[PDB]
PDB file of C-alpha atoms in Angstrom:
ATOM      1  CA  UNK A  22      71.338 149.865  69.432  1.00 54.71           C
ATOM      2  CA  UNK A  23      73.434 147.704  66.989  1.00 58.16           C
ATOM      3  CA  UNK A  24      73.028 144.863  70.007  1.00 58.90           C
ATOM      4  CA  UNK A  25      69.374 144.807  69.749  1.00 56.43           C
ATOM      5  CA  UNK A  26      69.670 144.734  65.870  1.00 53.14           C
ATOM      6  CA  UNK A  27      71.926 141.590  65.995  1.00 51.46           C
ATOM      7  CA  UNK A  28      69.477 139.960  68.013  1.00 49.60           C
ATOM      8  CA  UNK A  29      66.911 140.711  65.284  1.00 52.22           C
ATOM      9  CA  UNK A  30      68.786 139.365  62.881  1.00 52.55           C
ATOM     10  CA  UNK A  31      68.974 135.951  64.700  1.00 53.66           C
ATOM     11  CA  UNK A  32      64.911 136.004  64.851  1.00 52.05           C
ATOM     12  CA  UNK A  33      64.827 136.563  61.346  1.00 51.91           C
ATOM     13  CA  UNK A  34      66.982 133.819  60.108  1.00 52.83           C
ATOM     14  CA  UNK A  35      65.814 131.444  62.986  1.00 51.12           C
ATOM     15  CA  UNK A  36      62.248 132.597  61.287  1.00 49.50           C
ATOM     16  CA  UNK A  37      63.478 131.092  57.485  1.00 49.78           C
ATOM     17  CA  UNK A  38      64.630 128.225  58.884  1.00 52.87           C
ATOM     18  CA  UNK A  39      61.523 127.380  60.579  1.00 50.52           C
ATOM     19  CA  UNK A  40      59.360 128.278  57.541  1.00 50.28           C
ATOM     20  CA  UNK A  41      61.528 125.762  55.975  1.00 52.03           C
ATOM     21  CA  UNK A  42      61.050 123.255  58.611  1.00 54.01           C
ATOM     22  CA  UNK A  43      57.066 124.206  58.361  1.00 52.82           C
ATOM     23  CA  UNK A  44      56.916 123.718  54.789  1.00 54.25           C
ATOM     24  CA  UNK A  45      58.818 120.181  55.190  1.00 54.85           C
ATOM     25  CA  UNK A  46      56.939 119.265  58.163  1.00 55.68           C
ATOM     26  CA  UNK A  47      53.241 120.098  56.328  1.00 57.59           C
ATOM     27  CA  UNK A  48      54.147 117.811  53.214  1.00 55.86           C
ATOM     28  CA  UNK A  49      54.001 114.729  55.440  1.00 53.39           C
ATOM     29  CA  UNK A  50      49.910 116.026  55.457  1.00 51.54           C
ATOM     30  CA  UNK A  51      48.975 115.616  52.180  1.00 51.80           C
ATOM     31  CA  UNK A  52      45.513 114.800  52.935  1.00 51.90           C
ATOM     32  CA  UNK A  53      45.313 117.793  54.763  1.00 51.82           C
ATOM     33  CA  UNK A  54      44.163 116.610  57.752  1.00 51.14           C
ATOM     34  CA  UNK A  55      46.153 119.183  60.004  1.00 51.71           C
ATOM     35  CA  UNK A  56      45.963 122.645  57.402  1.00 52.78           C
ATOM     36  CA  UNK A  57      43.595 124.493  59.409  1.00 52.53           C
ATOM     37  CA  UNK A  58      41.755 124.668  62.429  1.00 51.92           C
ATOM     38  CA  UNK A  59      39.211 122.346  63.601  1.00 52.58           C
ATOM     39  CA  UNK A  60      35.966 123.953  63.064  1.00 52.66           C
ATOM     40  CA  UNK A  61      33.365 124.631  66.133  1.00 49.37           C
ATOM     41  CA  UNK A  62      30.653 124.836  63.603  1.00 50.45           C
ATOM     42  CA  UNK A  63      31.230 120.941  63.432  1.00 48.11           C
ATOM     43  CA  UNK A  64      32.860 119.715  66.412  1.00 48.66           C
ATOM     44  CA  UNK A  65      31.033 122.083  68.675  1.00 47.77           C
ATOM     45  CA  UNK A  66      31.863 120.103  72.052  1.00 48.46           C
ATOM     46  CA  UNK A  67      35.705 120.402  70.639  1.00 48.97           C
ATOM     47  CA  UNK A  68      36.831 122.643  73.220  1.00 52.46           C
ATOM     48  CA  UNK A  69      35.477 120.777  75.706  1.00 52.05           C
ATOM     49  CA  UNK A  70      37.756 118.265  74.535  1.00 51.40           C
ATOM     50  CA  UNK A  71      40.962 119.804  73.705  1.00 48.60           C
ATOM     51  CA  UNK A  72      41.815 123.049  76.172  1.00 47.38           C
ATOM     52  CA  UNK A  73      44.713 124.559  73.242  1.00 43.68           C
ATOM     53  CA  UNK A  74      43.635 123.535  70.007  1.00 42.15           C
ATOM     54  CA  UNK A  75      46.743 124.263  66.918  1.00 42.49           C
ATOM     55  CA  UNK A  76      46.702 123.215  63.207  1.00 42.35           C
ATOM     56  CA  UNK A  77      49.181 124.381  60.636  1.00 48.41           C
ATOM     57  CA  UNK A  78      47.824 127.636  59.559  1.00 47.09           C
ATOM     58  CA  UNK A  79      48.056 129.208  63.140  1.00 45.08           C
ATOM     59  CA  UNK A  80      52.049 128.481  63.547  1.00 43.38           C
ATOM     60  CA  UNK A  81      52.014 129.725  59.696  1.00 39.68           C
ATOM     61  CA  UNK A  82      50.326 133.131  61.100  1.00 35.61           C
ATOM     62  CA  UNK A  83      52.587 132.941  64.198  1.00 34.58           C
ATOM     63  CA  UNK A  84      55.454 132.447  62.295  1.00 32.91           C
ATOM     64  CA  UNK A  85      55.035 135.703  60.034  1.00 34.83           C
ATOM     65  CA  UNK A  86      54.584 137.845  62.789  1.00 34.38           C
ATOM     66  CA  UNK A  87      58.449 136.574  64.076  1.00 31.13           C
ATOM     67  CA  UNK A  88      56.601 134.858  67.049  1.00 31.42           C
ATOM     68  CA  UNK A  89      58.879 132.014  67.735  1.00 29.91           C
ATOM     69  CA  UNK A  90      61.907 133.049  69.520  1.00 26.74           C
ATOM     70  CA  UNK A  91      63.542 129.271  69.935  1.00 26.37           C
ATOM     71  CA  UNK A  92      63.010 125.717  68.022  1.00 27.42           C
ATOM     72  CA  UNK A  93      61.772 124.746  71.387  1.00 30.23           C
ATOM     73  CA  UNK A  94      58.605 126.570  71.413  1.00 30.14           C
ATOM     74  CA  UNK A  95      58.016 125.642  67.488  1.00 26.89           C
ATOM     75  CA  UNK A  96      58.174 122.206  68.728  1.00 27.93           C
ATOM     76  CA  UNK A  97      55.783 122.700  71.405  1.00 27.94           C
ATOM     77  CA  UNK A  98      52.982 123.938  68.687  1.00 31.00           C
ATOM     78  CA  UNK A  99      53.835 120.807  66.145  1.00 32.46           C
ATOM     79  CA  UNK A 100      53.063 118.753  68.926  1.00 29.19           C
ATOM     80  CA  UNK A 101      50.190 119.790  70.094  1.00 30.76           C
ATOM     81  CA  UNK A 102      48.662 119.138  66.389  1.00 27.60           C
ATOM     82  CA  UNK A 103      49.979 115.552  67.400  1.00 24.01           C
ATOM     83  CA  UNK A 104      48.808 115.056  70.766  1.00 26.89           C
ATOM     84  CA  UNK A 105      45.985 116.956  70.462  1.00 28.10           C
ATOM     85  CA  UNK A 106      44.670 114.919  66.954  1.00 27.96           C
ATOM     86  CA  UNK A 107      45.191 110.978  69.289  1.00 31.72           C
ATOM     87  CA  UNK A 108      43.324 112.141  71.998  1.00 33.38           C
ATOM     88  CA  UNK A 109      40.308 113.488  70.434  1.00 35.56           C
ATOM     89  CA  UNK A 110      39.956 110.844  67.764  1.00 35.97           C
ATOM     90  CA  UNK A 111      40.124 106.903  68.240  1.00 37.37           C
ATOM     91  CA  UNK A 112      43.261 104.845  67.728  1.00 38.84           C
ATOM     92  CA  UNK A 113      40.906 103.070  64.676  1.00 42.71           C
ATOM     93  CA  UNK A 114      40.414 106.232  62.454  1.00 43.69           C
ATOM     94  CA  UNK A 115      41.703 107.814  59.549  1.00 44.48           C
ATOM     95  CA  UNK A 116      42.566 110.968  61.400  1.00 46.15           C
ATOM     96  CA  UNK A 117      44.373 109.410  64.863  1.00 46.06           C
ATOM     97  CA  UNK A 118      46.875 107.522  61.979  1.00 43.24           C
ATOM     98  CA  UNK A 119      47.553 110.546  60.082  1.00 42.94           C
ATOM     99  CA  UNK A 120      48.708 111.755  63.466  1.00 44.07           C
ATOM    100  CA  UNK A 121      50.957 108.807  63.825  1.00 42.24           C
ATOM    101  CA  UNK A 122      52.413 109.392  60.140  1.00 44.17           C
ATOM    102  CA  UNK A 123      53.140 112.885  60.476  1.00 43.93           C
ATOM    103  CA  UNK A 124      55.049 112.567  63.980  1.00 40.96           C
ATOM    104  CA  UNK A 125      57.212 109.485  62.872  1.00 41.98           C
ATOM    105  CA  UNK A 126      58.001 111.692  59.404  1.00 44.82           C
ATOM    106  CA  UNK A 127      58.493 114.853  61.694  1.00 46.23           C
ATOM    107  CA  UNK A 128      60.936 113.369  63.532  1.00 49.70           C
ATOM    108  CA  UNK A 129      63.599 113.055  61.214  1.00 51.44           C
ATOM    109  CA  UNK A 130      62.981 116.564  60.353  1.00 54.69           C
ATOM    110  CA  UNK A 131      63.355 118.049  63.545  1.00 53.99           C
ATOM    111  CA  UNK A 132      66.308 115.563  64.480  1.00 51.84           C
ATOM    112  CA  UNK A 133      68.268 117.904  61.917  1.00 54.15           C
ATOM    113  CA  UNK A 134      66.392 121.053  62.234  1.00 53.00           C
ATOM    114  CA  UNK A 135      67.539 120.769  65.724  1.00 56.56           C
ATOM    115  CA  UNK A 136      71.109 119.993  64.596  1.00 57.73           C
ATOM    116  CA  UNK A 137      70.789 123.249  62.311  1.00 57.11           C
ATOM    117  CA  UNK A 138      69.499 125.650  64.847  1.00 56.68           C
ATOM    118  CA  UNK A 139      72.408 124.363  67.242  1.00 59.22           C
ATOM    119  CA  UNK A 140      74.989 124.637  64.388  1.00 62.83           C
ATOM    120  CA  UNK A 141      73.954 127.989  63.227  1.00 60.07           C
ATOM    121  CA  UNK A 142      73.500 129.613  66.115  1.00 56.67           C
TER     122      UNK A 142
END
């Protein structure tokens, strides 16, 4: 149907945009800190820890695959990196304040991405 085809082509552009906002969001990481997974090989009690671990290159894979249908749920996922990242490390380490840095950077980001989505339909 031409309906369902329209909806498509809202995923797809809502899908650029949010590369965009990806792209944007991972250059407030320059270190790297958040790029890919944490590793069980050396943080083997993480998921003891942290019940739904997320880094960059898992919303990158979701993302390619058209899986977020709303900013909302894009949000959710950037967050986790956050929240996830200050609970497992220590308000006195390198990796809990690159947490801090890339949410207060974020946030301008997604103040406008949200604007954007909104604006655009």
């Amino acid at each position: 149907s031409m309906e369902q085809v329209a909806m498509e082509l809202r995923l797809t552009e809502l899908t650029r945009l949010l590369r965009s906002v990806l792209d944007q969001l991972q250059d407030k990481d320059p270190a790297r800190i958040f790029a890919q997974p944490v590793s069980l090989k050396e943080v083997p009690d993480y998921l003891d820890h942290i019940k739904h671990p997320m880094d960059f290159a898992t919303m990158r894979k979701r993302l390619e695959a058209q899986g977020y249908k709303n900013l909302h749920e894009f949000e959710e996922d950037f967050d986790l990196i956050i929240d996830n990242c200050m609970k497992y490390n220590a308000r006195d380490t390198v990796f809990y304040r690159a947490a801090v840095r890339l949410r207060d950077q974020g946030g301008v980001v997604l103040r406008q991405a949200r604007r954007e989505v909104d604006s655009i339909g």
